[PDB]
């Protein structure tokens, strides 16, 4: 009858705390008046609340169900809409949760974290001008909000545009000290931005800070991998801390079932979290197609953020050479583990290593008899579960010097194999001849360019009268980094007219065709590049590479010397000056080389498909042989 | 790349109806430019324009996939909401619905159609007042929608305001011609109304528009009920026809699984769609209580629109006593069918027959051995697969000249039994002493009032100087209704004065004790009323019923002959009218017996539990008995 007593009670009750009473009282006031919009509207509140606590428990549903009653009762209620978005995002319902959080925003514009969360899930899908204005709205509201302005500093270090980033995430850390992404990110761009020591001393700050960061002491072993000469061990050390340190943070399993008989065909399953557009799949296109698909059966792990088009073709090669392709995408390391186990996999072959969206959860338990890394991370995964990974005896001298925790096999010829684009299309001549002097060009990241390589291009240049030098990079999409670039070379006594700093090229082909004014290729050290030897032989300009007691060191030196021009390589720095002003000194010689060296990859055993794959396959029956006895 | 050639050969394919095509340009084109506002509106509307294609032959969840697919593309699509909501109502998820068709009515004012659906929904869960107003939007926007308009008479016929639902009614039936829904609710507010005869055309109308309406027919047959002299036996003929149609309409089940052993436990399921306050849950919830549940076991199937606090208690006592209890609103009949073979049940008890929210299409297929109609609808069922139905020996006559097309069986004692309320309450002494007059009373439906039974009341009060008489009903709640009756009474030669019209009334303690007013209670004929009979028995005022040759008719004879009172039954009505002046003879006589029939009526077979159960528990063996041999 007097319900206004009832919901007194109830809000009594809400404000002490007890959820049962209240919730009683509100009951039964609305049963007695049907109508009641205050008490209504204090019912979807307290229902609110008691799917937050329970959320907290951590019933998803339940608290989605009192949510979803909530908004039956209050349909404009924008913190229910929100709730509902942030738990379709954790169900990994993306649209529906767009579709949420774009609600909520619409009803209370005051909801700066909506539209944080939104921007976060648009950038996820590669949307940058959606996230980046989504980014700046929320500081339009709140001009003081940390999360929003690290994630702005993440899509503009995505885009490009290194100074803002910065500002922006130095702004995020004086906002709030114990907040370690910020370091971590401070860190990633200082590492893309071509300079290395402050951003080791930042993620040891953020190592500080969050002893357990895995992103953090991941990527500072990776940049640490860049400064590697090859003459200290404090890298293995701090490899082995790592690899520990996963080791005892994650279980393992020790029990197998797959059989004893070295006779059967093996199930190799490709887990890799870039199938797309990336240099790794171009060096997995040819392996799998070549297979021999009834003697071993072949599976793919992609845990790839967006599917491209080359995405497609690989499926469709997959499934239709009698494969099963498998999307891993948003799933915890522990189910990815549990459905590796459940699939009958004999061995596993991952490409990630140390760089970004890894799968190394996987290996946390060893979910197969046998993990193996091959292309990506040239360095020692560091890992004691991984059992070996996979090299050759050029770029891994027997008499090597460089300690891995894992074994290595040395396969017969080569560890590469590169697959032309489709659309690659012909290779115009020299342009020497054109403009009557040589064109050095160099298409590498410029974290692998070091004061050493910039000494030694300058002694290059000043070697050979009339040289002009040409770079592509990205963060080349800044006018300071370049005048900071130009400057340097500058300070080293080489004239700004010889240099020509060139930004991406968002089409493939047009990159691919770029090599046409160039002559020379040249490539940084220690660090070398591995796709860009093989993009710039493939074009026919002479790539030479330095000589190194490193295996990323030797990559450049077995491609070279696989391909046949084994005489194309320098052991130490004058020898590589002597070289380059040999190859300098007549312009016909390139040209007829550029002429000839299309032909030259393209029968080399670089290009052969089915000798690899034949050399891969006795590698595998080799493995499992061994893993049998 | 030119997106703009692409996105016009899609709306060209759109216009010239190709989807397959234009949804091929369009993906293109947003995969060229992934934010083409206008591409992506043209987007929504091909998807949704697919789902209703899609919907159109009947793959709901498609349908919804797609849906939702064009509302993450454009989250303010009022079309797509709308079509979200239509399928959540015919997925029976009644909450989203309602937010669904609330945001769409938010985002586009212009969609009656959402408003009409919302007020529907409203009314199914007794929300008049959001009906009500909704339906007034709805003429606010659209005034010639004939939906909206049925609607609203249907909400104005359940309040009881039957004038403008009548009014609202003759304009919807003249807005469209062919729209027999219109037709059947005009004939059943004439029913509800008090008159019969142009219910009776209305109806006839309604059937020759539509042949094959189950809802015409059945309330035709329930209409044709009330005027039932038991002279005619076209009544029995019409019965036939549509039991005929109605099976020659559906399926039936030919097979049975059932033991043929005599001796074993009973699954007795009782299926009705009034568990709540209602007449039938009176009568039922006595044997429930009382039934010997280990050796014969219960179930129950309940289609209430609502769950009250005395469906609560039933399944409560069902499931401490050893039951199951089963809800089956919104659901196919066959699935009914289904569920109800898929059991193991028994027999089954329906308590509906031709009456509102029937379930005779589980009769269509005959689910089980033994279907039995038991209380509701007192004439005939009139289907051939219906075997039998329940009555008594003096309702029933061994020599009547009642015609059934089922078997019928005897109960020993009676087939009635009526339960207090808990609140009852004590009951007040004869108010004849305070004022010095009789007040006759009669709290039955005025459609069970008729010219006769006027002139026989008129006669009563005319016959006995200082006589009152009050009825109450609920189409006593609107002006016209009142003056229509009064002018009639008045027409026989009764004044104004001696009349007092009530309306309902809403507490139930109130409407049991509102009998304290009450001096002789007066039952209408033929269609003679049932639980008002023993809710007047009960409060110690003394009732009065006619005779007659028809079951209805004589259940109150019945009643009476029970209870203790038979020589309180008149044969004809002048033996009614000297009966009621005996009555009224004496005051001190009255009142004594009002005081003695409470105790009468505790100790009689009518309220007997445990005596009517075990005469129930050995029909029902008789029952299976017979089937098994
Ligand atoms: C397999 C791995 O390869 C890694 O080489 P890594 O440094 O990324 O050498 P990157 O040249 O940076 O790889 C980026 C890839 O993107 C493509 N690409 C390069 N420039 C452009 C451009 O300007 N526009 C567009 N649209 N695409 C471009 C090209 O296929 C190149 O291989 C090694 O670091 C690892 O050790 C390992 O060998
Ligand atoms: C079991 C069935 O009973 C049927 O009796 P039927 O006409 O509905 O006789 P009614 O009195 O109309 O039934 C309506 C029920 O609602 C309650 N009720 C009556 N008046 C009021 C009121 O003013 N206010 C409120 N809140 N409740 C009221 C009371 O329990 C009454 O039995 C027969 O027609 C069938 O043949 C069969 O016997």
Same sequence: chains 1, 2.
Avoid at 80 to 88: C, F, P, R
Avoid at 186 to 208: P, Q, S
Avoid at 281 to 289: K, M, R
Avoid at 325 to 346: H, L, P, Q, T
């Amino acid at each position: 009858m007097y319900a206004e007593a009832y919901c007194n009670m109830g809000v009594i009750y809400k404000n002490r705390g007890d959820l049962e009473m209240a919730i009683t009282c509100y009951e039964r006031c609305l049963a007695v008046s049907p109508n009641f919009e205050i008490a209504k509207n204090n019912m979807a509140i307290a229902l609110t609340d008691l799917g937050t606590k329970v959320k907290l428990e951590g019933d998803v549903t339940q608290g989605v169900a009192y949510y979803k009653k909530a908004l039956y009762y209050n349909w404009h209620y924008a913190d229910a809409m929100y709730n509902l978005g942030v738990a379709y995002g954790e169900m990994l319902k993306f649209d529906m949760a767009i579709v949420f959080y774009e609600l909520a925003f619409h009803f209370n514009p005051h909801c700066a974290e909506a539209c944080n969360n939104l921007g976060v899930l648009y950038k996820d899908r590669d949307n940058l001008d959606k996230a980046v204005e989504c980014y700046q709205m929320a500081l339009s509201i709140k001009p003081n909000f940390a999360q929003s302005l690290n994630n702005l500093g993440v899509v503009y270090t995505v885009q490009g545009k290194m100074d803002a980033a910065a500002s922006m995430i130095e702004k995020a850390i004086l906002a709030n000290p114990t907040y370690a992404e910020a370091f971590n990110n401070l860190g990633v761009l200082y590492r893309d931005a071509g300079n290395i020591t402050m951003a080791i001393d930042a993620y040891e700050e953020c190592l500080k800070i969050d002893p357990d960061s895995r992103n953090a002491g991941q990527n500072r072993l990776l940049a640490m991998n860049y400064i590697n000469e090859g003459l200290d061990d404090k890298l293995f050390e701090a490899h082995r801390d790592w690899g520990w340190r996963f080791t005892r943070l994650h279980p393992q399993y020790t029990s197998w079932d797959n059989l004893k008989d070295p006779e059967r065909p093996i199930t190799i399953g490709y887990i890799s979290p870039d199938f797309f557009t990336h240099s790794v799949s171009y060096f997995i296109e040819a392996p799998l197609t070549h297979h021999d698909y009834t003697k071993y059966k072949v599976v793919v792990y992609s845990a790839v953020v967006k599917a491209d088009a080359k995405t497609y073709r690989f499926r469709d090669k997959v499934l239709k050479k009698g494969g099963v392709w498998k999307d891993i995408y948003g799933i915890d390391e522990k189910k990815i583990a549990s459905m590796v186990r459940e699939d009958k996999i004999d061995i596993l072959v991952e490409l990630t290593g140390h760089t970004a969206n890894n799968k190394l959860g996987t290996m946390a338990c060893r979910p197969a008899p046998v993990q193996v890394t091959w292309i990506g991370y040239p360095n020692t995964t560091g890992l004691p579960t991984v059992d070996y990974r996979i090299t050759d005896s050029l770029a891994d001298p027997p008499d090597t010097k460089q300690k891995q925790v894992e074994e290595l096999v040395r396969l017969p010829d080569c560890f590469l194999c590169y697959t032309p684009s489709p659309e690659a299309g012909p290779v115009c001549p020299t342009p020497a001849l054109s403009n009557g002097f040589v064109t050095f060009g160099s298409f590498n990241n410029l974290a692998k360019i070091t004061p050493k390589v910039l000494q030694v291009w300058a002694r290059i240049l000043c070697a050979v009268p009339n040289s002009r030098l040409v770079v592509k990079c990205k963060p080349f999409c800044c006018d300071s980094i370049r005048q900071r670039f130009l400057t340097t070379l500058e300070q080293l006594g080489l004239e700004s007219k010889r240099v020509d700093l060139l930004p991406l090229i968002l089409f493939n082909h047009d990159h691919m065709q770029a090599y046409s004014l160039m002559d020379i290729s040249l490539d940084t050290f220690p660090y070398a590049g591995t796709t860009t030897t093989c993009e710039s032989l493939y074009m026919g300009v002479p790539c030479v590479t330095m000589a190194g007691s490193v295996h990323a060191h030797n990559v450049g030196v077995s491609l070279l010397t696989k391909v046949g021009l084994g005489h194309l390589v320098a052991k130490n720095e004058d020898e590589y000056v002597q070289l380059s002003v040999d190859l300098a000194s007549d312009v016909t010689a390139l040209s007829k080389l550029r002429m000839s060296l299309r032909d030259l990859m393209a029968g080399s055993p670089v290009c052969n498909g089915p000798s690899f794959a034949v050399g891969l396959e006795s590698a595998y029956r080799n493995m499992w042989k061994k893993y049998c006895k």
